[PDB]
Structures are given as structure tokens and as C-alpha cells.
């Protein structure tokens, strides 16, 4: 029997129903093992808030939503890992917090669909997505500030 | 247990082919022959030995 | 609780802003991938 | 059906309880959205013409 086409168990984390013979991680330890334990690159999928703490630069406006489509390239923020497991994102004057998202177990392929021509385009499989991050405003600090 | 076809995701039933018993889906030609023993225990709750009252 | 280690920088790229899509298979576990499956075509609408 | 089972739950007792429903669905030839919609429409009665 082919080993890469066996039947799959309902539990996606325990699909190994037949053999030839997971604790919930944290973002700080995640990045630590991603950089210290190994050096291989990893593709992440983080969810940013609706409005970023910035203004659309010369985008013809209004206090509207400021997303990544309005920001330019270059360094836009820093990622801080404090003690006791705190993972913050300093995006300027304010600091958001980064937590682990829903632990997806199904296949997630990050691909690039580039329509170079109006008749023929190219689909480029960039990689696989395994972990999901969630960035949230530190509302407590924003409230105790003013 | 409950098994599903990797192709379309429908439930797999157990049938008999020309060589051996196999899991098969009713909506695709996907099959899977059984090589070794497969078991699914349930461990039902044992009738607790009731005690005399009074 | 000071930021002792891992002061990672965050960069932004706009090269694939309009060409980046996310495809997720709710019925296919992450263990088995479609890398070995030969694809034939993809229909799409802008 | 795998997506339906994942939506219902991944617990062993959940699958054991939901098994009969999947079996009864597989007894009929309902496997697509069109077939299920036709089966539902067959069970629909007009609001008195
Ligand atoms: Zn199938």
C-alpha cells in the first residue's frame, strides 16, 4: 500500500490511524525555537487590527482606516519579547500585543497569483502556512495613558 | 470508526473487491485495500455491581 | 518584564500587494500536500 | 461530509452520535447541493395556491 495516500482519521492532529510499527505553544517560545533552535525561515499569517496607529500618507484622505495598503516600504515597527511571556509590537508611539491565533491543522498554501498579462497569468506557490498570529491594541495602556 | 475519502471528503464504507476487503466511497472511484488488522474498540461501561440497601 | 531578547524588526513590502492570494483547504490536512499532484489549469475572475 | 463532521465536533462520542445521521444520508442518493435542494422542495407545500 502507498504510504502517502492512507486513510485519514477525523482528528487532523492524529491522522496516523495505522503505523508502520500536542501542548498549546506560546508566541515567545515559538519565536525562540524558530530562531534559536533552528534557522530555517517560516511563513506566518498575522491578523492586524482594522485601523493602524497612523495616517494615510498623501492618499487624499477624515480619520479613515489606515491599512498596510497605504503605508510604504521599510521598517514600520519593532517586535519586543519581554519577560514572563509578553510579546508586544511597537508600531510607533503605541504598542500592540501579539497572541497565538486558532491552531489550524488543515492545509494552508500561501501562493502568489500574478496576472502579468491580460490573457495569461502565473500562479506562484510561495509556501505553506502553519501558525496564525493575532495582533490587538493594548486597550488597558491606552486607557491608563489618558 | 468513521473514515473519509481524501479525494472528496465523503464517508467511506467497507465492501469486498476482487482480491480483498476495501474501503470505498460512493461518489468517486477512490478505494483503499486493507493490509493488516483494523479495530475500533468502544469499551462500554460495565454494569456496576449494585449493593443491597436497608 | 523588560524586552530582554528578540528585538525583531518589521518590514513592509508592496510588490505582491495585489497578486497575493491565500488558498486553504478545509478538507485536506496539512500533512498531505498537493505538491506531487500534477495540476492542469486554473480558471479565475479578477 | 468531512467538513460537516468537523463543524459538528471532533470528539469521539460526537462522531459516534452523529454516525447514524451520516449513514441515513448515505442511504439516499443525496450528495450534491442540487439534489438536496430538490429533496427539500419535494417536502415543500404551497401556501394554498
Ligand atoms: Zn470519496
Curated annotation (Swiss-Prot), chain A:
Post-translational modification (record): Sumoylation on Lys-5 can serve as a signal to mark misfolded Pol III for proteasomal degradation.
Domain of life according to the entry: Eukaryota
Cross-link (Glycyl lysine isopeptide (Lys-Gly) (interchain with G-Cter in SUMO2)): 5, 16, 146
Coiled coil stretches, renumbered: none
Cell compartment(s), UniProt: Nucleus
Family: Belongs to the eukaryotic RPC4/POLR3D RNA polymerase subunit family.
Quaternary context: Component of the RNA polymerase III complex consisting of 17 subunits: a ten-subunit horseshoe-shaped catalytic core composed of POLR3A/RPC1, POLR3B/RPC2, POLR1C/RPAC1, POLR1D/RPAC2, POLR3K/RPC10, POLR2E/RPABC1, POLR2F/RPABC2, POLR2H/RPABC3, POLR2K/RPABC4 and POLR2L/RPABC5; a mobile stalk composed of two subunits POLR3H/RPC8 and CRCP/RPC9, protruding from the core and functioning primarily in transcription initiation; and additional subunits homologous to general transcription factors of the RNA polymerase II machinery, POLR3C/RPC3-POLR3F/RPC6-POLR3G/RPC7 heterotrimer required for transcription initiation and POLR3D/RPC4-POLR3E/RPC5 heterodimer involved in both transcription initiation and termination.
Identification of the protein by name: DNA-directed RNA polymerase III subunit RPC4
Organism from which the protein derives: Homo sapiens
Curated annotation (Swiss-Prot), chain B:
Subcellular location field: Nucleus
An annotated Gene Ontology molecular function: DNA-directed RNA polymerase activity
GO biological process: defense response to virus; innate immune response; transcription by RNA polymerase III
Protein residues bound to Zn(2+) 1: 5, 8, 25, 28
Keywords of the record: Antiviral defense, Disease variant, DNA-directed RNA polymerase, Immunity, Innate immunity, Leukodystrophy, Metal-binding, Neurodegeneration, Nucleus, Transcription, Zinc, Zinc-finger
GO cellular component, one term: cytosol
Disulfide bonds: none
Function field: Core component of RNA polymerase III (Pol III) which synthesizes small non-coding RNAs using the four ribonucleoside triphosphates as substrates. Can mediate Pol I proofreading of the nascent RNA transcript. Anchors into the Pol III active site to constantly monitor transcription fidelity, cleaves mis-incorporated 5'-ribonucleotides and restarts the transcription process. Once Pol III reaches the poly(dT) termination signal, can induce Pol III clamp opening and transcription termination.
Name of this chain's protein: DNA-directed RNA polymerase III subunit RPC10
UniProt source species: Homo sapiens
Top-level taxonomy: Eukaryota, Metazoa, Chordata, Craniata, Vertebrata
Included range, full protein: 1 to 54 of 108
Swiss-Prot record, chain C:
Function: DNA-dependent RNA polymerase catalyzes the transcription of DNA into RNA using the four ribonucleoside triphosphates as substrates. Specific peripheric component of RNA polymerase III (Pol III) which synthesizes small non-coding RNAs including 5S rRNA, snRNAs, tRNAs and miRNAs from at least 500 distinct genomic loci. Assembles with POLR3D/RPC4 forming a subcomplex that binds the Pol III core. Enables recruitment of Pol III at transcription initiation site and drives transcription initiation from both type 2 and type 3 DNA promoters.
Assembly information from the UniProt record: Component of the RNA polymerase III complex consisting of at least 17 subunits: a ten-subunit horseshoe-shaped catalytic core composed of POLR3A/RPC1, POLR3B/RPC2, POLR1C/RPAC1, POLR1D/RPAC2, POLR3K/RPC10, POLR2E/RPABC1, POLR2F/RPABC2, POLR2H/RPABC3, POLR2K/RPABC4 and POLR2L/RPABC5; the stalk composed of two subunits POLR3H/RPC8 and CRCP/RPC9, forming a structural mobile part that protrudes out of the core and functions primarily in transcription initiation; and additional subunits homologous to general transcription factors of the RNA polymerase II machinery, POLR3D/RPC4-POLR3E/RPC5 heterodimer and POLR3/CRPC3-POLR3F/RPC6-POLR3G/RPC7 heterotrimer.
Name under which the protein is recorded: DNA-directed RNA polymerase III subunit RPC5
Gene: POLR3E
Coiled coil region boundaries: none
Curated annotation (Swiss-Prot), chain D:
Compartments it resides in: Nucleus; Cytoplasm, Cytosol
Membrane-crossing segments per the record: none
Subunit structure, as described in the record: Component of the RNA polymerase III (Pol III) complex consisting of 17 subunits: a ten-subunit catalytic core composed of POLR3A/RPC1, POLR3B/RPC2, POLR1C/RPAC1, POLR1D/RPAC2, POLR3K/RPC10, POLR2E/RPABC1, POLR2F/RPABC2, POLR2H/RPABC3, POLR2K/RPABC4 and POLR2L/RPABC5; a mobile stalk composed of two subunits POLR3H/RPC8 and CRCP/RPC9, protruding from the core and functioning primarily in transcription initiation; and additional subunits homologous to general transcription factors of the RNA polymerase II machinery, POLR3C/RPC3-POLR3F/RPC6-POLR3G/RPC7 heterotrimer required for transcription initiation and POLR3D/RPC4-POLR3E/RPC5 heterodimer involved in both transcription initiation and termination.
Membership in a protein family: Belongs to the RNA polymerase beta chain family.
Name the UniProt record assigns to this protein: DNA-directed RNA polymerase III subunit RPC2
Species of the source: Homo sapiens
Portion of the parent chain present: 248 to 296 of 1133
